[PDB]
Symmetry: none
Subunit: 48 residues, 3 copies
Amino acid sequence: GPPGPKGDPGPKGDPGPPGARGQAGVLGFPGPPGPPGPKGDKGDPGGY
Amino acid sequence: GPPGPKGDPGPKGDPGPPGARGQAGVLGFPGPPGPPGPKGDKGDPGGY
Amino acid sequence: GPKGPPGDKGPPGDPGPPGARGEPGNIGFPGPPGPKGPKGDPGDPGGY
């Protein structure tokens, strides 16, 4: 008998794999300066 | 005789490509404050 | 009659899902030392 017709196109492929993780973020800014030190000791008493 | 059956569906397509890279990470938090400065200089001496 | 020939290969899949966001950047360095404390007061003059 006559051959049957050609089949239909194959199915669409599966989705691709998940993407790679993003790069790590940029390093934070340095902290602020510390406080001033304490005030120095009073100078020597004057002589009499 | 009668016709043959329609052919089978074609082979499945290729998988897609990998997804896009994820977003870059958030910036680090700032560092902590620095230490205190040293204690100040002793004062100048008193006079007589 | 004989079964027909198969269909052609299907079309390709979609790109995959996006990657995860990157990790945060490192915490920044500790801040610089604060300034030296104020100099001490001068000594007072001696008594009589």
